[model samples]
Target: SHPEQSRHLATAIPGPRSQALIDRKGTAVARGVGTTMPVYAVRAGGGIVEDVDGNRLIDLGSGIAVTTVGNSAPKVVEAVRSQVGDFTHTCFMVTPYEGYVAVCEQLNRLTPVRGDKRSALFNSGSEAVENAVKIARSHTHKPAVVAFDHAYHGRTNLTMALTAKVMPYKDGFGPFAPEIYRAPLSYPFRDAEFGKELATDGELAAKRAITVIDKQIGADNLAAVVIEPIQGEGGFIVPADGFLPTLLDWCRKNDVVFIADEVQTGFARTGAMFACEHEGIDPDLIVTAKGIAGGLPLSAVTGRAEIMDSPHVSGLGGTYGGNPIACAAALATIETIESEGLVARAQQIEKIMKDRLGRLQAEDDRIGDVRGRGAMIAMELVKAGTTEPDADLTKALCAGAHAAGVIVLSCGTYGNVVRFLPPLSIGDDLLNEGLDVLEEVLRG
Candidate 1:
C-alpha cells in the first residue's frame, strides 16, 4: 500500500538530508537535467511521496502522469521482480519474447480500433512518435507531416518542431527535420476569428484548420496529421467536441494518416482508455507511453495492419526500445487498471476536480476557466479583468503549492495553465486535502 496517506513534515521542506543530496547532486548530475521540489523523494506509494527526512507530501502530478496505477503498485512490483529474475533483456528483435508481443496484443485490443491492428513498442513517447511518422511516410509515400499548434508530442527534434512552446523544451535546439508543418488547433479558451475572440464551434474550427493545411501543405503530400487528442504540455487543452472527429474524417478522405498522440492521455488517464473514444473517432495510428508501464520507460505505436507493416523490417526498432522488464511492468500495469477500475476512478477524480476547482474559480477572478475530462483536468490562469496570460501567478501558485507540500505542474505555450494529473489510485480525502492547500494558496 501507500506510505501512511497523510501530509506530515518531520522537518523543513528540503530537510538537511535532502539538501545534502541536492548539493551532492549538483556536482554529480548534469546541469541540464532540470529538477523541482527540492526535497528528495525517498519513497512514494498510493497518494503520497515521502521525502528524505520523512515528510509525507500529497502527490498531484503523478510524476508527469506516469504512475496512473500509482507508484510501486503491487502488480507492477511483482511483475518487475519476476521479470528481473528471468532476464532483463534479450533484444526483442534478436530473440523476440512473449512479454513484448503480449503487451502489443493488449495495446492492439485496447486501443480504439474496430478492425485488425498491430503494434510495435519503443522506449519513450518521442520514439513512438518518430516511428509513427516514419510508418505513415512509408505507407502513404508522402514526406510532409502536419501537427497542430499548442501540442507537445515529445522533446526530440521532430517533436520539438511539433511542440508549440519554445522556452525550456526547444530553446537551444534548432535545425529541426524538414517537411513538418504547424496548423491551428481549436483551443476554445483563447481562439479567435479575425481579431476578436470567437466562441469554439469545432466543425467550423476543423474546417478552418483543414483549409490551412490544404492551402499550405496540401493533404496529398502529407504523410501524417498528428495531434494529441487532448494537448498535454501545451496546456491540457481539450479540443472542442467535433474538432478531432472532423480532422479524423478529413485525413481519412485525403489519405493522410491521422495520428493520435495518446502519449499522456492513454492507459485510462482520460477515463476512456484512450481520449479518441470520447468522440467516437478512431485514429489510423496511436502513440502511447506515459501511463503504459506504471513507471517504467516504455512507449508504443499501434496502427492499422497495413500502415504498421509498411515500414522495412529493420527500420523501426531500437537497442532498448521494448525491454522485457518494461514489458512485464506494462502487462502488470494493464491488469492493475482492469482489476482496480481506474477508468472509473478517473471519472470520479473528474467529478471531484470540477467541484473543487470550479468552486475555486468562482471565488477567484484569475482562474479563467476550468476544463478537462476524467483525471486529466486543467485551469488556465489569466490576469484579472482580461484574457492575458498570468504565467507569473501560475509560477507563484506552483511554488506555493510545493511549499505547502502539494505537487502541481504548469504548462501551455505561455505557461499560464495549471494541470492536475493525480493518480487514479489516490484517495478522495488525500486528493481533496491537496486541493484544499491549492485553494488556500490561491485565496491568499
Candidate 2:
C-alpha cells in the first residue's frame, strides 16, 4: 500500500543511473527549471522516494507540500484511475460536470469564509490568485491591491508584482501589473529594524502597514489586501499573534476585500483545514492549491457569494480549470483527510518537529529561531553573534542532507531558512530519522 517508510542507501547518492539522467536532463530540460535533488525518482509514497538507482531517501519536502496525503495515496489513486477511464477532460465551461460542482461544494463547506459561499475553479494557484484579485476589483470597484514583504504569490505578471522576492522570480521580468503595493510583514526574528516592541506586538505591526496603506494607497482606492496567514516562501514566517485579526478588522472597516492566500498552508498542512483558522478570522476570499488534489494540478477561489458573483458570466472560465480527474482526486483527498484524521496527525508531527528543532536551536546559536504552527516549521540561520543571515551555511546544510539520503528544502527572502514540510502520512520513526540526519549534517 505504501513504500517502505525508511531511508536506505543502495548506492552513492544519485549513483550512475541518476547521474546519466541528470546529464541527459541538462540538455533536454530548460536551464531555468532547477532541481534541488538530482536523483531521478521512480516511485514515492508515504515518506520515501525510491530512485532509479534503488536508493530510498527520506522525503521531508513532500514535493513542496503537494503530497500531503502521501504520493499515490490509495484513495486519490483510485479516484484518479476511475475518473480517467470515465473521462479526462470535457472543457467544463462548454459542458458542465458533477465532479467539478462537487469539488466546489466541498470547497465552500471547507473554506474559512462566512456567509453563503461560491467557488470558481482554476488550473493553478497563480490563476486562482489572479481571479481572486479580479473578483475583488469587480466587487469593490477599486484598483489598488496590497501584498506583504517576503510574499511569494506566483509566476504570473500580477502575482509576480504581488511577490516581494527577485532574482529567480522577478529578475529581468519587468513591465509588471499596475497598482500593486508592498507593506511590512510581522517577522518576529527580524523585527530589529522596528525596535523590540514590534517583535511581539501584532497590533503595532498592523498599524505600521496600515500607515502605509493610508498614506500611499487610500482605503477607497484599495480593492483587496491579499496575504498568507503563515507567509509561505517568505521563510515560512508565521506572523505574531493577532496580526491577521488586526488586518482583517482594518479591511472590514474600509470595505476592502480580505483575501487569504492559503496556497501553501491549506488542507491540514498547518494543523487545520485552513491556516486562517488559527487566527479565527474569516477572509472575504480564499485561494487554495498545492495540497488540494493530492498532487494533481488544481486550484480554486472560494468566497462570499455576493463578491464571487460580481464577476460577469464569461469573465473567469479557463479551458482546463476543474478537470474532472483533478476534481475526483480533490474529493478523494478531502475524504481521506477527514476519514484518517490527518488534521490531528499534523499537530502530532508539529510537536515532534518543534521539540527536535527547538533542541537544535538551544545547542546552536547559528539557528536564530525555530517557529511555525502544526507541521509547517522552519529554522532561520544566522551568524554566531549577529542576526546577519548565513545563507552559505543554509545551502551547505541542505546539500549535506541531500548527500546523506534525506530530502530537505531551503527558503526565505534572505535565502537562509531551512524549512521542514514532511507529509502527514509519514511515520514517527521516519520523521525522526530524517531529523536525525539533518542534525547530523548540522553538527558536522
Candidate 3:
C-alpha cells in the first residue's frame, strides 16, 4: 500500500506560495518552458512529492519520466555526495574518469542490441540522438535519417528536424537540419481503420511505411531509421507486436541502421530494462536518457563497436559528455534498480494503472484508449465517443487532477493523451490514491 490514500491537503493545487513562485518563474524563466502541475516541490521521496506548502502529491509524471529510481534514493544520494567530495568536474575530455567508464560498461551489457557494443555518454537525450545520427551517417556514408510521424526525439536543431511535433517543441524554432524524413506510425487507436489485431495493424502500417521509404528515399541512401519502440511524447503509442520486428527486418534488408531512441523508455521505466526487449529485436543503435542517471542530466548512444568507432577518434565526445557526478549518479541508479527489484515494481505499477484506467475507460466514452506496456501507460481523451481528439478536455482533466493532489502529464501529437510515469518504487496505496483523484476529476 505504498501509494494509496495520500492526503489532498492543499486548498488549491499550487497553493499560495507555489503561485507566487510560479509568478516569479514566469518572469525569470523562458516563456516557452512549460509546467504540468504548478506545485513547487520542496522535497520528494519514494513516489511522493512534498510541495512548498507541505501537500504530498503522488508523482505520476516522475519529472517527465526522468526519476525512475525515485527522487532522493539513498544510493543515488550517497554516490553523488561521494563524487562531489572527490571532484565534481574536470571535463570528461580533459580528464578521464572511472565513473564514465563504469556507466559505459553498464550500457554495453544492458542494451538489447546484440554483438560487440560500445557507448558514448552525453548531457541530454537530444545530444545522444544527435550523436547517434552522426555516427550512422559517418559509418554508412548516407544523408537521410528516417523517423516516424508523431515521434518526439528532442529539441535541438538536428533533433527538431527528427521530431514531428509542431507547437511548443518546434514552433518558431524552424530552419531545422535537412535530410530528416518522416513516415507514418502504427497508431492503432488513430488508425483502427487499418485493422483490429495488433499484429495485422502493425504489419500493414510497417509495410505501408516501408513502401513510402522505398519509393521516396530508396534503401541505399538512408543512413538510419530512428524510432521509439514505445513512443514517449507521442502519447505512449506502443507499436503492435510485429510492427517493430517488421521495421527491423526492413532495415536489415535495406542495410539501414535501426536506431532505437530509448531515451524516455529505457533504464527500467517500461518494466523491462528497455522497451525494445518486449519485441526481442536487436537494433543497430540505441539512444538512452531520462531514467539513466537517477534524474541527473546524462544520455548515451550505444551500438555495435564497429559502427560506433567508425568515426575518427576525436570526432565524438563533448566538454561535459560524461561528467563525473552524473556518471556516479547513473552507476548508483543502475545498482538501485537491480537491488531494489524496481523492474518488478515497474510491472506492478503497470498492473495498477491498467486495471484502474481500464475500468474508467469502460465507463466513459471520453476515454478513447488505454494503452502502453509496463509502467508507461497513457489514456487518450476524445470528444464523447468520436475520433475527434478532445485536447481541451484533456488539459482540464490534468488541471483537475492536479487540484486533487496528483501529478499527471498530458502528451500526444494533439495533446489529448494523459501519460503516467510514476516511479516504480511508489507504494501501491499512494498509487491507488492518485488514481482515485484522477477518477474523481474525470468522472465528476
Candidate 4:
C-alpha cells in the first residue's frame, strides 16, 4: 500500500546524509550527472520513497519514469534475484540465452507494428534510437532521416543530432552525425496566429507539416521519419488531433519508415501499452525503453519483419545488449503490467491528473497549458497572462514541492514545463496527496 501523504520531518530536503553524499560525490563524479529534488533515496516502495533521514516522499517523477511498477517491486525483485543467481551476464551476443530470446519475442508481440516482426535489444534509449536509424538506412539505402522540431530523441552522437534542444544536450558536443533534417512540429500553442492568418478552422497543423516535408526533404531521400507520439522533454507536446495519422499516411505513401520513439511513453506509461495505440497508427519501427525492465537499463527496436531482417545477421548487436538479468527483469515487468492491469491503471492516473491540473490551469494564470497523454502529463509554466516562459518559477515550484516531500520533475525545451510520470502502481491516495503538494507550490 502507498503512503497517505508525503511526510516531511526534516528541515531541508536533502537532510544531512544526502547532502554529505552529494558533497562526496561531487569530488569524484562528473558535474554533468544532474539530479532533481536534491534528495537521495534510501528506500522506495509502492509509490513512496523514504530518504536516508526517513522523510517519506511521494514519487511523482518515478525516477524519470523508469520504475513503472514502483521501485524494486516484488515481482521485479523476485525475477532479478532468480536470474542473478542463475547468471548475471553471459553476453547475449556471445552465448545466447532463453531470457534474451524471450524478451525479444515479447517485444515483437507488444510493439504496434503488424506482420512478421523482429526485435533487437540495447542498453539505452539512445542506443535503440541510433540502431533504429541505422536499420532504416540499411533497409532503404538512404542516408537522410527526417525529425520534428522540439523533438528529443536521445543524448548520443546520432540522437543528439536528431534532438532539437541545443543548450545542455548539444552545447559542446558538436560535429554531430549528419543527414538529419528537422520539420515543423504540430505545436498548436504557437500556431494560433498562423491559423488565424491562414483563415483555417480545426487542426490543420499536420497537413502543414506534411507539405513542408514533401517540399523540403522529398520522401524518396528520407530513410525514416522518427517522432515521439507525445513529445517528451519538449513540453509534453501532444500533437494536434489528426497530426500523427496524417504524418503516418504521408510516410506510408512515401515508402519511408515511420519510427515511433516510445522511450518515455511505452510499457503502459501512456494508458495504452504504447502511445501509438492512442492514434491507432501502426509504425514501421518502434523504439522503447524507460519502463520496459523495472528500472534496469534496457532498450529495444522492434519493427516489421522485412526491415528488421534487412540488416545482416551479425551486423546488429552489442557486447552487453540483452543481458540475461535485464531480459529477465523485462519479462517479469511485462507480465506484471499485464496481470496488474497497469494500462488501465495508467488511464485512471490520467483521469486524476487531468482533472487536478485542469482545475489548476483554470485558476492559475501561471499555468499556460496542460498537455500530455495518459500518465505522461505536463503543465507549462508561463509569466502571468503572457507567452514568456517562467523557467525560474518552474524551478522554484519544484524546489518547494521537493521540500514539501513530493518528488517532481521539470522538463521542456525552454525548461518551463513540469512533467508528471507517477508509476502506474502508485496508489490514489499518494497521487492525490502529491497533487496537493503541487497545488500548494503553484499557489505559493
Each model's Cα RMSD: 1.3, 0.8, 1.9, 1.9
TM-score of each: 0.98, 0.99, 0.97, 0.96
Model 3 TM: 0.97
lDDT value, candidate 1, whole model: 0.91
Error of 3 at 295 (Å): 0.7
> lDDT tens digits, residues 1-444, model 3?
122236657657779999999999999999777776788878887878888887888889888888889887788888898999999898877889889999999999999989999999999999999999999999999999999998999999999989999887888988989888999888888777545664356777899899989999998889999999989898999886688999999998888999999999998888899988887979999999999988888999999999999999889999988889999999999999999988888998899899999999999989988999778999999988687899999988888988878888999999899989998778898889888888888876
Total clashes in model 2, counting residue pairs 3 or more apart in sequence or in different chains: 0
| Backbone steric clashes in candidate 3, count | 11
How displaced is residue 36 in candidate 2, in Å? 0.4
Among the numbered candidates, top TM-score falls to 2
Best by lDDT: 2
Model 2 regions lying over 4 Å from their true place: none
lDDT of candidate 1 over 64-160, digit per residue (tens): 9999999999999999999999999999989999999999999999999658999999999999999999999999999999888888888899988
Q: All models: lDDT?
A: 0.91, 0.94, 0.89, 0.87
Q: What pairs collide in candidate 1?
A: none
In candidate 4, which residue pairs clash? none
List residue ranges in candidate 1 displaced over 4 A. 192-198
Summed backbone clashes in each candidate are 0, 0, 11, 0
- Evaluation by TM-score, superior candidate among 1 and 4: 1
Rank the candidate models, highest lDDT first.
2, 1, 3, 4
